[model samples]
Target chain A: DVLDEQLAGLAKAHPSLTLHQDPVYVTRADAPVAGKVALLSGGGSGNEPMHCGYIGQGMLSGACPGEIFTSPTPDKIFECAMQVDGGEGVLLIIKNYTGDILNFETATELLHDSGVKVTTVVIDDDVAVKDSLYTAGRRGVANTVLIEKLVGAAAERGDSLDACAELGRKLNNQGHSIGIALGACLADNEMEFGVGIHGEPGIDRRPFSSLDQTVDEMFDTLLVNGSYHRTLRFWDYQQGSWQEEQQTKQPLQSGDRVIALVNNLGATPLSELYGVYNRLTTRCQQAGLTIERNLIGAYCTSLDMTGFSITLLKVDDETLALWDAPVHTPALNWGK
Target chain B: DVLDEQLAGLAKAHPSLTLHQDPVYVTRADAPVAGKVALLSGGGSGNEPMHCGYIGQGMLSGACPGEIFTSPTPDKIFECAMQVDGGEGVLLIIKNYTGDILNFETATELLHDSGVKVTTVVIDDDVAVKDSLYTAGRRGVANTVLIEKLVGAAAERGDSLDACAELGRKLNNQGHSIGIALGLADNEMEFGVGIHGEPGIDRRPFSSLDQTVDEMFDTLLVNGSYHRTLRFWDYQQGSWQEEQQTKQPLQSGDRVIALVNNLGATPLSELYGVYNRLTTRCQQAGLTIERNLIGAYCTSLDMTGFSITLLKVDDETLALWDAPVHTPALNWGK
Candidate 1:
């Protein structure tokens, strides 16, 4: 209700906050930053207090809520930057998708003309969907939460817009996500793989599977990507085998810190999410990796899709602390 | 997380609040009443911050939570009341269901030797299912929220345990509900109906449906009940042939109140639609409904079925309804 009134007022008073009447709520942050970089991110609705829910205080300065399962309009991206851009310019933390890419690009150009510096980072950590017709790239699932947190910290630390954008883009390129729906996501007795946050058909659907197999498949996908081999992987590799041949079969080392995100697709309850967390913690321990920090609840949901996406941001101490930094949002409480 | 620790501690240290490990986190709220009536209610686990979420308040001295959809064990029930009962008595506000009735009945007998007073009120307001193989009676849906509010008020008002029990029973008997799930509630939809889709299968596939049919059915069934008939047709009816034959039109002086329950199947949008249909139907029914409430008061397995319960009131019941009640789940401001 606050969002409704705020958005309505913005539309009425400020002709600059271009509005997109989508299923979800998205408002671009607009402030004259003396020299600090800006941040932007978004996802589905229903996590009432997520996405738009965490727009204030040590969190996202701007967010674009996509319709239940759809992406936001290009105009929304432009408008969000227009409002939130300070003199130092804006950094768009875009979730990787064809629609998101297309829109964010348009917005980037619009800002460039205004002599406002703009940079974009696409998150494509989800390993469920490989290459798809609908997606321009791999699905950007839960790791966006971490990307926002770390990048927001970097910006707050006086990183240039280019530096913050580079850090976010680096984190996205290095991260990997895998998810499985325990019970059937669509029909009564089916389990789905690679489903998007909006219940967009996942990679495959089978009979209900155990939580172990679900988590295993997710880990296997990450393992195949070889992104889990080290604390952090440089994102400068060329396409194809340049990454594969250079990868190793070693498991993650102990004392390794990583940000673990437990994202609810939609329908999975917080209790069940905690259950999943218990299992995932055990698995992470068994794999010789220490979870530095973890997040749970709906981040990139598919409009009541009952599943969760796990993103492992293999990080050093600094990134781990940033992930642990205080954030004030509806569902999360890192800070007082 | 706080609830989990509090419950675990209660189970370990307290004689009451026994936890059933089979279905997951189902715990019984059994405390011995020195001389007071017992209050008991429960449902699935997620709406936390409900049922158990509001357990510490004065409303439900005790409650039992079902596993995602499974009911609690009877022994646990006996354990909860044994802890709460002091001497006056205990009242069980059992939602209308075979499992709840069976469990609460078992607990009642288990406490019989303890000199604990036990009474039961089975709430069966749902009109979603007509006659189902799974349900022993119409499922008690969201009216539980209102029922608890009213009963808690009466108890707080210094009503005797027996009086509170009678009040609960009267309200339960007078209430009826009907609702429909507008959209498909399958895997992702776990907060609306029961876990197993006990009420009924959803009608819509993906798109949300209009609540015209559901609202009409719920309003008509509530207004056409036997209690309403007695209250409206006391002087005119002999065999009731004329009213039944002529569709039992209500007198212009008839007054009513309605409550809309989300049932967890449909989201807020559909709930709003149901509200629209409900008010429209009430206006057309020639009934002057004084008050209306809409929300996810009582929920099913999170399956996605909503029931609208109508409480046909007389002067006494209306006054009781207005009584102040304080419960963690449902509270009235002074």
Candidate 2:
């Protein structure tokens, strides 16, 4: 139930989703993304609804799943990026992970060398693990949902590979997400803040007694550690290795229009997510955050993990407009 | 997970579904079943996505869910039956259980008294125990899913109340479902299951899904004691079966469709495993399997059990089954 053992059942039931072989992956079994720049994003498999479930006309063109907590091989990613490429180009929506970046970087080169116009936007939005020494720098968690969505719409609307890549960059840097877990620990009040999608427990184990308190502290912590000053490492296709670029975080503040996402890490039922959405909208409005769009579900998940993450991506008219564009995927389907 | 603790999340996720308060239940957010005859089906709540998820543009107008494994009150079912009924009519798809039948009958009577033309179709296709501790005869099981789908489509196609009622009866007669459990929490392997966690005929030891599916086939296909009371509904060249066999058995060369259903919480792999054996058995008996579906349709509170349902099919039955249905759990060919 946690991992997708019923994926075949899903693809069988849903005629739109198709399975690819050689190294299996799933994509929209149609041509709605026919003439547009295709969007490709994938990582581990356990994140149930993420990369695969979002493969459709308006979202990801296709997604490659690795073996559970493992990153996909470069060859598999390269094949996916190559096949899903319409005449326009292919954009790699990668998360900020060492293995992911390394393999996706290699595939970006393999794709470009094979006469494909390829570009990638790295997502490094989780503000919890800010210190690089701790883990794979801020483990690109839920903000990638917004990234895939906006970038897919951009491509679907005929934005060039470069334009969509720039949009992904803007979204990644402008958004910030933080999560917490509930159970016994320094968790007297039953919550451990700073938890990531995986059971990588948070450094700050604050007591969480209520949903209001949980969302308030998470939002405040988003603002508290707003200006994340760090060097971002990305793939350099020409050099065929890693490259660093210094980027400054534009701290979240009032007067900001936001696309909010409340993502479940599996095992969190939908009814409670509705309550969380109310609290989120209330907190956002109280803080002068104009909620332009919202997505709430177990879009990204860990195995049976009873936790949820909140992602706030700063947006403008163009980004918000694309965010509202039509998407029909397994996990995320709307506006169609 | 059980009683839809995330009902608001469902409402929040998909705006198509609505939540009715007071004598609480869920219905369509939009009044789209306007000019057409509305369809309403309900029973205990733990059967997630059965009644509620099937409420949409082409399916049930609304569904009333009670608490976990408990039937909704007569008051709530009546209110929904009243609200969903348009000028055309309202059809109640009632599963054959004591509580559901009583409540929905009261609602039907209430609707009739209030000048509404209310009709109903009772489902009792569980080839399990003829008279369980829970009911007078057989219990209504997974066939309700197919019943709702076909009846909803027939209503959509502008069938009258009487026509739709007959269709429901014919479908209920055509479909048969029997299930087996791998291991319960208390670790009992139940054959001939009820939708709730109630036990079936008796217990057996644990084994493979293939063996279980084979044994289930023995009861329905071989024993030939479980079938509709009347004979074939095929209007062409049809005659009632012999007076000797009350159960019109599936002999060699009979064409039928099958469904392998999960009783909630049983993974899809095992469901398909059960289906693999089911098809093999059908082929061995020379019963041509025309079509098959395998998934969690009707369920029993997270029990590790699966059911097999077969419906004798023809062109008309197959055509109605193919009708576009846009619901949460079931949406296809649209």
Candidate 3:
């Protein structure tokens, strides 16, 4: 078996970086200062390239990776936050898992005690876990990326720590995600619906189905509350007044704009996400809705579960601009 | 059961910006443009964001994706290459697989017939697959990314198409990769490996004892014939002349870089620490290594394995730094 001492020894070699042993996290302390608001995010270890891969400019300032499915300790989170906090207060973009919520909350309290104004916004977007018997509420899934992207831009805009916190909360409320696994979590043939990021049992299980049906079911679940449509209407109403103020003001139409995110729940590949995008785009066209921007890939994954989640973000110029802002991570980098 | 029509419907909905479906396989087309020569690459699917994700600017011209372990048809590859070709003649970056080689060869012939000067480079980096049991020599693994990155930069430098092709072939020859899967292919622990477990037989049964020793033995066996020591005699001579000409201006010492790639099978979380061991060992062995770049680059069909490739470079590493090429597949506009 792999020895723990060997692992710890490896970590010690990199002095410019920090390594936390318990939850197994590593990060660079001497992150470059690019003048933008630094975005700090992280969760568990099983999600490869999620927290760690996204620790660059335009993305997260630092990421606190925990053990497989376990939340990182408060000390590690606080250290990362303080290290990456560029004079401006740190914005903690957290996923809404019970463990993550607790640990991040503790870190926030500790940061507050340290006189570092730490603003936090927890993402609770998964529509699959409907406040079920086994869980507290819908666990955060793929929409974390969208939340991080928007908040990263807010930070870049030099928004106050409080403003960033408020926007993060507002955006989290505005976004919703639902996913269905076409195959099992690290198993063949079996599939799951509403699987948690930690490979927890989903709401239901069935044999693998066609990609179309799976995507349709996911979108249907997302559209069920009519909350998304309501948000779209609110966005239109807000945009209408802004447009009316312009010299060549145009009336808002039903099919103006919408942002789409097709997330791979770990095992689902980008090609499949492309397929989801195609279907989603087609459905949007049929409904006379225009897709402003589309993102595909493993934004949030359930540890090798062959599934995908779709997130619909009703866009305004501010949110769209935030989405367009550059980010640098091992997996994603933009706005060079 | 999942029907092909349903899959087709999904494809219709996600009309792949990179991947396309005809009959046998799903193909992805990558097309990025700079004033330099164009580069195209592809492989099987199930490797998330591989071939396709690296299609933006500063990377590939086109990537023709295949099915899950199946190779793309010649027609698909030809169509993809022609679509991405902007009179700069396309470079076909192919992995060393029997079917891939044959299909790309056919496509190259077809493209040549159409007056499109096409150059093909086969990547055979994996040191694990011996010339014995599973067909010919080593299987191509993670080194495809470095090969593409370095050669893509050369192409972006407006290097002759022949020069770019030669560089790709030379790099692939110099590079070697070997991996060990600690568990079964379907085991939860093996998720970091790619879709196919072509690297080696799983060694889970032997995990109870001497795992590192056994792993090192296996790695050494694969890397036996390869040259581990990189010499700087040529560079030293060149540097001596340059120093004499410039009156001995020494700002920094000579440096050699190493790029560690996870062959779609290894996790980055595990890779960084693993690479620390690999790099430390190399340094202890008297290698003046400068920096190490690590990540999942080249991948198999979702196989759980990782490969390490070493590239020796000097001031002549002009191929990596050149003009910016914009492609729809790679991380461009950054």
- CAPRI tier of model 1: incorrect
Give a tens-digit lDDT track for model 3, residues B62-84.
66666676666788788877777
Better of 1 and 2 by lDDT: 2
lDDT of candidate 1 over B8-101, digit per residue (tens): 4334322334454433332334444344455666655554334653443346676776655556677667766655565666666766556766
TM-score of chain B of 1: 0.72
Measured with C-alpha atoms, the lDDT of residue A122 in candidate 2 is 81
Candidate 1 vs candidate 2: the TM-score winner is 2
* Residue A21 in model 2: lDDT: 73
The model with the greatest TM-score is 2
A113-181 in candidate 2: lDDT tens per residue? 888777788888888775443246677889998889888898888887778887888788899998777
**Chain A TM-score of prediction number 2:** 0.91
TM-score of chain A of each: 0.79, 0.91, 0.80
* Candidate 3 residue B88 C-alpha distance from true site, Å: 4.1
Q: Order the candidate numbers by lDDT, best to worst.
A: 2, 3, 1
